[PDB]
């Protein structure tokens, strides 16, 4: 039925269409390793519907809105991605360049059609990355086009004509929760905090990465790189992992580059490892974590 | 100090 | 009566007569757990006229012009669906995106369609979400489609050619009051305030919403319930319960949900409620609510 | 143009209930130049919310026994190039074909404004079309015509513009007197029996009260009884002073003080 | 390719690509002296993954974003410019001008217009000289201009819609690291300190600057400047020269040098220098040095 | 220029050509009385390259910077006019209203503006009477306008788009120096003094004031005023001359000066002197100075 | 003549106009009184050029710029009055909150519009009470608008665009003169110390308000270190000879001693 884009202008409705994600590398649950409690509750909000439907349906009903914060480079995006791969729905990826425009009006009709569209093609995800751009605080004198893009947003999220039974989710990443609205921080009911990576995490996350990389390391060796990369984030051991690659590159004399010898390029060693530490250095500063966890006792569902 | 933009409007 | 619309193209006549809300799931006034003053006093705007309009006609008519103020998530949305409902009469669900063209000089005649059609098909309600987007307080410095658009709006509302007699409610909610125009301020002569649920409107939201579904709930295990349940909004309460009936899920093992059938559930009891309330949070801070006091005194219209 | 004078021809006002002077009361300095005059080409009205100036337009309409043009933003404005200086001509023409003519301007401020950054040439030519046709109209005095207006925000009326308009006028809040005027003019209507000392008591409740807020407060004082009964006219008990206790426990100025010692001073300026 | 261009408008494609530099006068990695450890850093980014795509695809993958940092004039628009020549790739010099705009949702478009257009001509190399300017630390109350282009910048740089391939270089060069944000920080993995040049950069830089002089002066002579300009940045050099080659001109009588041919010139000896080192000082203080180094031990790459 | 002035907008053009200064009455290098090195160094700067460019091109080319800083009064503004007339070239008087705008983005453009339409008119002096109003320290927590505006002053001045050989000076008078950016200090390279007058200095100003007043003065009256005047800078020295030539006319008889002509006006003669001497004062306190003779010996340029 | 304010905004035009203000009842010297060495210099500065002009002109011309320093309510706002009226010129006041405004960037172009305009007309003085608050002392840390702001009145002032002929003064009346920014300082050559009533002053002011010898002497003397504002209100409540001896039974000298310190460093005076 076309009474759905009856209202909506034609362009509108292809450019919402033009933001829908294509078949992107295939990522699963098991290659984000770290946070179990927000892989466990996105499983029960996303897969346990499809399953029997019938069973959850009602007040048994997944809710329509997801928050997920941390510091920078905790898997945020990841998990997205891995949301986008695994849930076998519609996925929307939005930013602020696709719904700001500068003439008057274009701004809340974007919004409006986007939710119009992802209704049609239910199930659908939409993924807002750094949504504290477009729902930040009511202002006192803000210009207009924020304050109506804002309501816009928060009316098609909760409305009288919504009448529930809608399998639209909406999924934003921040790394600053406490500017969001008030009243966009109740409609995204669950709100997920992804802390760094432990040593579980870390030895994971070094696992599979040297797993594609065929190399020769011990249990103590993998011990003693887990004790050394304290207060890493996952980024921070991807980067690692990186550096620690070129270390057969460099050990070989620089002739070798012209006739490169792919086969000649030694394993990965711990020797690699040892010299990668000193040029690695963790992103994250401590003095920012503390405001976070405030926040998760204040506001998180994680128990 | 604070400063403001401003919004285009088609008339044709 | 074609007369009242000569001067209106039909295109922007159907851009207003497609937003007409169509009768949705039922919802009645007990459905509404909260505040019985609010209730009573919309009774008697719109049930007692219809009822018996030769009593209620002339001074006694109903006035013209609401407003709904409070936090975020305490049922100004279900008090526009009740009203929708019940007063069996045209509802027009309008937003920013409606009214708002990018063409110089067509909000105004968007208004002016809208309030023309509205007073075609009498009674009618006209409901707006979030009106402090489109009735703000007039700035310095706007730019000139807002400004026409709010004196449009003040004219249509209060103007020479208004007259009694015309059975049209504009109903507005919102989460900033002190925003709105005073000239709008005046139009809406019957502000109420919906403040946070108390012990009994909870204990009514529970028991409605638990009754729906099978279970044994002890009185005092209800009374505990409701007494731990503090500072929740309406919106709170509900998602209690919907994480509250998740708990029988969770209890079964792993791979059942495929097969399991609907009978082999378990009912909720108060473990359930229990293990709820870990991970469960108010919503709202205290913090905002000092504001809404302030104002409540100075313009409410509530004892 | 047959279609383009037909928009112009259906905005004149239509028949209604009557109004008379009488029933104003609290502005009489106002009245008595309205008056005057009626029976100095452009009179601008401004003042708190809710101070009456819709009334005394919809006053003069009925009075005055003249053509009567109810003009906002909406209809003089159009999306096509070129057309709304056409319009206003066509309006101008009209007015003056039609003697005599008089044209009410609801919120003026929206029409024509103080010029600021970033305003479009349709508006700047539409007010320069106003300003010219208007100076044109008025200097040979051949024809009888008047223009008034109301707005709430006197301050953002450009200067150019603001000239021609040469009568200004301030409505402030009612009086004790008209506040009591007011309360006998509307509940005479509607069989009540009360004391004088009664009404004086009620004035004084009621200060900084606007008549929109006294009206709201009279409509809660006649809805009372109703209130008072259980779930004919004749059942309606006579309306006494407890329903107006009753009524002053949900009735609040709607005004605030902020902004008057604004409207004070530039009536004292310009005013 | 109108394909990855058709969302964008002509404009914003003319006006990036007006940004490209034009390839000027060619400046060689022996022009630049001192910066052992970040030319070899630059070197193994940019040079080698020419030379053999295959190898260095994948986990060694070169990273996307570098950051310079360190006093006033010491040679970081010098790298920029040195690999613009050699890096054998299109070359985009932004800056604040550019990007920002004052109309509504401007900022934003101009940054995905700009990482589009990179995106097509590839390998590419974006250049943003003075990145504090843009890309600091995010805070309360600011215009949301500023916060909408930070987040823009940010989901260009990484986000769901990138993926690996797709060579893109982002350099900046910036005097003041500790106000960069935390966010855009992360994007920057290589992050380099440039200090003042030593006894060897100066001596390399004096006798490089003073060979195309034509002059003479022996070995005791050139110990002897490079022992006394000590503090000296990279700028202070080349103006200790630049003003000891106007001594010949001095000696001459005022009214011959309109008369005096080119060949009648005496050739530079130890005496201007001499003369010069009088009237040039250092430009910079060593009170704000320290800082550096203590950044530098926090979060720099360097060994 | 279309070719390099095509991307700037045609007003911001206009506005900048609107600070073209006229030539005005002309200033001789003679009239300004006292400094030498400072006026040796601006006639090496500007009037050397204009007679040989062959000589001068390369290695010996203009600085392109210089920065004048004294206490009020020592003639920093009076250099500059004389530089406006003798140097011939084409003249800017830039202020912080020519830059400074309340809309996003306008003041960067503006600056790249300025520098476009300056490298148009070939050579060209840009002077700035203030530069510590413009050219600040950086300071956290400041408004991202100012930023943005020196951050365009340092990429304009010392970008990768600055070639050699450009004739292009920037001239900038402050009395606060050590305020100034270090960033943009180092641009600035020469930094000239300009104490307040010595004694042959006030010799030579009341010298040149008084000739063409005709007055009999003996040598040993102007040695003994020039003792009298001490600490004082030229605006005092004007000032004192000033109120010396009314001398005559307040001992002119009462009532007759508006009747009166300027024959039978007397000679001045030592008598006013010292009446003008008691009323007037030096104008700057000697605590201030020695801050300023730090700052020269520290990072001044002068000998 | 509009051709110079051509590239000025219109809307700061129309404000700059109506900050003038019309000619108030006439004034002349002798009414406020009080005040010797201060009239004759600024009579000198002020009326002199206009009645012969001629002679004037030159290296004996008018300084632009004129300083009043001294304790609250010395009569300072009447001297600015009986120039305006007196020197038949266009008279611009300006107060420190005039400039001010919450965007960025308006108060320098308030400053560029108000001095155009004046300059528009020679002949113009330009009063500004509370100059010691828009124009202070810069310190190392302040707000950018108000360093701006200082440095554009700076520049207008002085600067390489301004030239001779200007025929334009600025008046400028303080009570705490060691805030002024020395470059500030400088422009206002010409500095004057407006002190408390003299005994014939304060005597004069009284008979003249007012309206034996002995009583008035005995009135004039027994009222010590009081300013003109002080006597205006005792003889206002005293109208509504015992009643004025009534009123009498009806500031601090310790500050004042900075005033002289000031007055004997940069003051005009003898
Ligand atoms: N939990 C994790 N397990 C494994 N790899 C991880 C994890 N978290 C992050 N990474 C690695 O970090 C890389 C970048 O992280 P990602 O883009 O997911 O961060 P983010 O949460 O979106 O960051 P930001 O807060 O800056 O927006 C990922 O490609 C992956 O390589
Ligand atoms: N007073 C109430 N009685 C019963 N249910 C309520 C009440 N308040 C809220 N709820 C429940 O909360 C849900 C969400 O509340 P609702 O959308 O009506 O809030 P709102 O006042 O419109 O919020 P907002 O301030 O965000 O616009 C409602 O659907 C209803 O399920
Ligand atoms: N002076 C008055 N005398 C009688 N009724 C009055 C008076 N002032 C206001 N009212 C009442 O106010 C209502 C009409 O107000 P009106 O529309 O004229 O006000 P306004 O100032 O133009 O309003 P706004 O600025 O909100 O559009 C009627 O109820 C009228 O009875
Ligand atoms: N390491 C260096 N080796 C040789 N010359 C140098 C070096 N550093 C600076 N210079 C000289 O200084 C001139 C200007 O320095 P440059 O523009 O590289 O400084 P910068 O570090 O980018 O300064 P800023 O912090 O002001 O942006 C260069 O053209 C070159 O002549
Ligand atoms: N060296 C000098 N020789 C002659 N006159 C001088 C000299 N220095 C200052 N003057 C006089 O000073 C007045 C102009 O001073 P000028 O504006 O140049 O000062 P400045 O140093 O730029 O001041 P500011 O610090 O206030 O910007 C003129 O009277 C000029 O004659
Ligand atoms: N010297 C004086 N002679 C006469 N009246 C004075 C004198 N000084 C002050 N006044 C009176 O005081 C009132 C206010 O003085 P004001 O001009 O505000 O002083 P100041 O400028 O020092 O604040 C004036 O109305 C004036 O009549
Ligand atoms: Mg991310
Ligand atoms: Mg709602
Ligand atoms: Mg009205
Ligand atoms: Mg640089
Ligand atoms: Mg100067
Ligand atoms: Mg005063």
Known sequence: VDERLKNLEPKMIELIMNEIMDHGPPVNWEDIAGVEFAKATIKEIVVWPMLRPDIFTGLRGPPKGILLFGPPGTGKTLIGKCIASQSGATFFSISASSLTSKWVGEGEKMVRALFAVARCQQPAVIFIDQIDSLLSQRGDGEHESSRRIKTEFLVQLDGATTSSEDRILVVGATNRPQEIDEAARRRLVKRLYIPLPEASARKQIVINLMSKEQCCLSEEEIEQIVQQSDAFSGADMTQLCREASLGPIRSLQTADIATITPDQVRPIAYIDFENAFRTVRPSVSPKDLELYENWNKTFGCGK | ?12
């Open chain 2, 1 to 12: 100090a604070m400063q403001m933009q401003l919004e285009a409007n088609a008339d044709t």
